[PDB]
Design a protein around this ligand. Structure first.
Ligand SMILES: [Cl-]
Ligand SMILES: [Cl-]
Lengths: 706, 706
């Protein structure tokens, strides 16, 4: 192997000069705006088919291969969705039939407007908790036992319509890329904190206690006190039934996860458990024997459309923003999992449009918000879900339960629903193991995780997410805050320049300094960059310039008085009796020491690194060439330019040639916009690589030696 | 000038093997915590000298060179500080003697604990506005005419004590680097919007109208409506006097800065205008002839110490946090303009300590928060101020006014004080020109400017600032969100690789792709990076792997059925035109298509790019080597490393070699912590430069051809 290169030393200017560059009209936004408004027949059809995905996958339906799997997966997911809807309507503190409305309407709208094929659409615990908190805050700020739940149902419907409107607006404006602003560790900490929230929320149903509608901040600790202050009134039948259901459900769920091969269809343990619980609570008469809290009689049928309260809109706009963002984040994560697993495209913008429309229709018809539960999407995909016909059949099962056979869910206890909702928490609760992993790998992401979790538990579920996103954006600045700037030296007498402190037998060319900042320099970076550059070169260029200007002022004062005669050979002095005296420039003239040294008045050049007459003392420097390795400097903001240009100017003023190497052409094109280059700072300071600058320096210095 | 290199082709591993690495100790947190508790004699001496700067700059005082200049500068800045304190006590809506207390106490404390030598310590308009808003909020939220102003004075004192406590705590924990979290454009937009706020807040004194204590959000609009709703009751004498004062002070400040040289000292125009205003108001009896509002009679002397209300602390935690942050940011900016101008070190943590102690003492003695006014600091520096003895003399002048000659300021109108404030406001108002400048230079910083302005005008000054810092952190993500990822190619048959779309006569080695992402490839951009890499290579590695696994499954099915035979020659097909039968794997068996292809059961190689027998079709790829130019990739978070590892594995599985080049030694070391490396994704994929990777590819491929 041999790396044999023989070419000329290239500046960026000399390179672009010798190699003619393909002229490219990069873009404007006028032509982009107009080409975005072409409205060709083919473009109009493409837009109308991207807004109505069912027109594309329904005619391409593979009946023989998909119909039975869709029917089976739909039966399973609908049976699960009925119970999940009842439980999550308990989480919202409304009658439990509105959970069935929330399980019915978004699935039917997403069947038409959605691009995913494997997610089940409906409520999930975190969003039901967020909606319950939003409506408990909306009923509080309201300028004035069945009226209470009626007002709560109205507030839930209005919160749902507003969050659906926000989602639909975000999908129309094509902002479907907001999901990138939530990292894996932020989502992890938020979801395990929310699982702890839900665990705490199910305690009033396991024990059958009466807990107020507490609100954030610190709602979880308020709910814990309300629960364990009454722990002497705990219903024992509710507790025992909930523990039995939770135990059996978790055992059979682990069995389903472990024996996923020998099992043809996963065991529907939730269905069996609720059937058995309702049968034993109806046969043994638990409602009057043990005084348990049961689901009770639900009204058959749907409710007429409702009108959204704009007062609730005003009172909960921010809560609905949080609800819309969490709903989209969760649904897009689950849908992305399945789209990567089955290799089909997933339009994020369409998701927002599909979920917003579903939430609007749901809230209009008295349901509450919901996008996708990973627990129900897994039940749908694991049972053979091939298309969104499984969602249609799940919604048909929900419709059958709403219209015909809801009376069977009358003797079912709320502790059983709470036990199921608690059984679905193992996956999120065991994410506490991410703390140690992230500690090992990346402590900024461990900070995001730990720091998200604390915010969400301490604050609310919607305020915690906002503070968490802000802190996660702050850790990006933490990463690039104190960069490990280094000094480079040549190792091997070749074109390899490494850290000066890392290898033996390196070589720094005399008078040359190579400095590397390993990160994008921004506003929070440039003071540190200047401090480290000054520590690396060994002096402050502005201080050297100021002392040189002081020395030049003293030389002029001593020479125009006659004590120092100018000669083209040197600084001969007729009298060597200089007395100690400083000019003591006042506050209004001291700014004259930062000006460039223009000593062309004297016929000969002053050597500032030699000794000056009459004991005038100036700090002597060895540096004559400063190379800046800008390879890993991705961007420069407005603050970086101002800071860098001023840094460069002082170096240039004290006669130190500055070279910037390792930058691509886009970097220099962007630097041309800041009006960075001028006289005394030109584009000739940019070279290709560190070696290119180093060979230029060597030839310059050997020619100056000649 | 010829660049000639002849070295061996170096992986990172081969370079570490050939060049022995200088062993360096671990900078452990425990040993660092060991140096923390030094208990050394000189260490304790320097700690005490750093906490009490006066013990170091007072003995080193130059009397004959500094004393008279400091005396004159102190006289001038104290005469300015009296009037500024009165005006800012107007801004806080308390009696005007508390502005004198605010101009006295912090200066006397900063004389002892301040590392600056040129700033004038006291209130400035933005902080007086913030303190007044915090006081109005506190009096609003307080659980149930002189009593109203007494309540306001107590709330101001308490808000000040809490602001000082927060500053002192931030200085004790050594967090004096938070000023880096405010860019130049954030500060510019904030100070322009705040100058607009201060302009609107002085209108109730120019016109002499009764405006309620409006509070944010949109307090600027509320105050404008209440002002221009009663614009008919405007006092004409107040407006005329304010306009005359404003015209004169603006003209004379312009004459001052235009003719700095001819004037030995700047013309004191606020003082002269105040004396003339008070004289024509007392002689001509403006208080009874025109019913003008005057400063009134002030209580001669100081007030006894007060105890901070903890109810006010509870009510204004966040308000005082914003006040502390704005105070420190402003004082540090000014202090930094003179440290640099006069070349002395400025400790930020001692700045926080001194400002916090000054605010605590001021609030205890019935003052309001203040750090420094750029207008007053400029008067102190521009008049000859050399040390903080000028601040001591200004505080002595404020003391004289408080105790002895305060009654002279009795007939002075408040419109004159408002006019002085506006004359000082002109400078921050002139920052509207930065909009077009930033528009031309950097549009992310233009966005920071405009959004900071809008957040500060619409929301509060404290909420406006909080929102602004969040959006400015978000723009950092906006920059690195959609990087200009590009494909590279060789120019000149040497080691120069540039954008494939930029020059003519470039060269792509057959089968090699070189991909460059020019940014830290973090959580915001790993999906984008993945998509762009897939667009660059021309295919999806996972899709090719899945179709190859499908083809191999069909091959094994047809070969164990006896339909085809295996031979060292290849596949022998006695039967051709096989019946096409897709296996149609189910949802729980399909992830077997993502497994590595281990066809060692068959003795011969299966050339997946050749023709497969019996109508089997797989996509063919020309790519056999993929180079990733990670030179400008600064950092990688957990999300990046998971996404990056996933991308690499898919490529490796389809037999495409992957090389990562251009990364420094520190970057590879960080990667090891993440456990990125394992079997099949080794450390041998890292090479020094792109040419090193390319020379390795060529030798590998030519050896395989040989
Ligand atoms: Cl779930
Ligand atoms: Cl000011």
């Amino acid at each position: 192997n041999q790396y044999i290169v023989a070419r000329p030393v290239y500046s960026t200017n000399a390179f672009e000069e010798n190699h003619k560059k393909t002229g490219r009209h990069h873009k404007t936004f006028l032509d982009h705006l107009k080409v975005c408004c072409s409205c060709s027949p083919q473009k109009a059809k493409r837009i109308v088919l991207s807004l109505f995905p069912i027109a594309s996958w329904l005619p391409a339906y593979r009946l023989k291969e998909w119909l039975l799997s869709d029917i089976v997966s739909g039966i399973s997911t609908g049976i699960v969705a009925v119970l999940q809807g009842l439980a999550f309507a308990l989480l919202v503190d409304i009658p439990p039939v509105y959970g069935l409305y929330a399980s019915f309407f978004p699935a039917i709208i997403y069947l038409f407007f959605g691009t995913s094929r494997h997610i089940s659409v409906g409520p999930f615990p975190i969003l039901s908790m967020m909606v319950g908190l939003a409506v408990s805050g909306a009923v509080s700020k309201a300028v004035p036992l069945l009226d209470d739940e009626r007002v709560r149902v109205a507030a839930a419907a209005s919160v749902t319509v507003l969050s659906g409107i926000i989602q639909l607006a975000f999908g129309i404006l094509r902002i479907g890329f907001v999901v990138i602003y939530l990292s894996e560790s932020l989502i992890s900490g938020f979801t395990t904190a929310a699982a702890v929230h839900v665990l705490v929320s199910q305690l009033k149903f396991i024990f059958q206690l009466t807990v107020p509608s507490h609100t954030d901040p610190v709602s979880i600790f308020k709910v814990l006190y309300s629960v364990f202050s009454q722990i002497e009134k705990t219903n024992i039948a509710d507790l025992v039934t909930a523990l039995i259901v939770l135990l059996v459900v978790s055992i059979v769920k682990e069995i389903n996860q472990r024996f996923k091969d020998k099992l043809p269809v996963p065991i529907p343990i939730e269905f069996i458990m609720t059937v058995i619980a309702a049968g034993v609570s109806y046969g043994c008469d638990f409602k009057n024997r043990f005084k348990v809290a049961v689901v009770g009689d639900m009204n058959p049928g749907f409710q007429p459309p409702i009108t959204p309260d704009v007062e609730t809109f005003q009172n909960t706009v921010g809560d609905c923003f949080g609800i819309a963002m969490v709903a989209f984040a969760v649904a897009f994560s689950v849908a992305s999992v399945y789209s990567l697993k089955y290799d089909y495209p997933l339009d994020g913008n369409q998701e927002l449009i599909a979920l917003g429309l579903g939430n609007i229709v749901c809230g209009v018809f008295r349901g509450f918000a919901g996008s996708t539960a990973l627990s129900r999407s897994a039940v749908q995909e694991s049972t053979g879900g091939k298309t969104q016909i499984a969602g249609l059949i799940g919604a048909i099962i929900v419709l059958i339960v709403v219209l015909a056979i809801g009376f069977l869910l009358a003797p079912l206890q709320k502790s059983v629903l709470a036990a199921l909702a608690l059984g679905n928490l193992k996956g999120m609760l065991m994410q506490f193991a991410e703390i140690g992993r992230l500690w090992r790998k990346d402590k900024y992401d461990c900070l995001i995780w730990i720091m998200t979790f604390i915010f969400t538990i301490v604050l609310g579920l919607g305020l915690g997410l906002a503070a968490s996103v802000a802190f996660q954006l702050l850790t990006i600045v933490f990463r690039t805050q104190f960069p490990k700037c280094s000094t480079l030296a040549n190792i091997g007498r070749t074109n390899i320049y490494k850290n000066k402190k890392d290898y033996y037998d390196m070589y720094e060319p005399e008078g040359v300094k190579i400095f590397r900042c390993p990160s994008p320099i921004y506003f929070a970076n440039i003071g540190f960059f200047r401090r480290k550059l000054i520590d690396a070169v060994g002096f402050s260029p502005l201080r050297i310039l100021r002392k040189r200007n002081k020395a030049l002022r003293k030389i002029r004062k001593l020479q125009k008085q006659g004590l120092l005669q100018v000669t083209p050979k040197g600084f001969i002095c007729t009298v060597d009796t200089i007395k100690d005296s400083d000019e003591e420039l006042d506050n209004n003239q001291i700014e004259v020491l930062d000006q460039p040294i223009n000593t062309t008045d004297l016929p000969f050049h002053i050597d500032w690194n030699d000794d000056l007459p009459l004991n005038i003392e100036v700090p002597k420097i060895s540096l004559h060439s400063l190379i800046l390795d800008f390879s890993a400097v991705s961007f420069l903001d407005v603050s970086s330019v101002r800071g860098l240009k001023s840094i460069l100017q002082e170096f240039i003023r004290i006669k130190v040639d500055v070279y910037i190497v390792g930058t691509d052409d886009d970097f220099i094109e962007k630097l041309n916009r800041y009006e960075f280059f001028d006289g005394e700072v030109k584009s000739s300071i940019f070279f290709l690589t560190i070696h290119d600058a180093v060979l230029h320096i060597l030839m310059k210095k050997d020619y100056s030696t000649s």
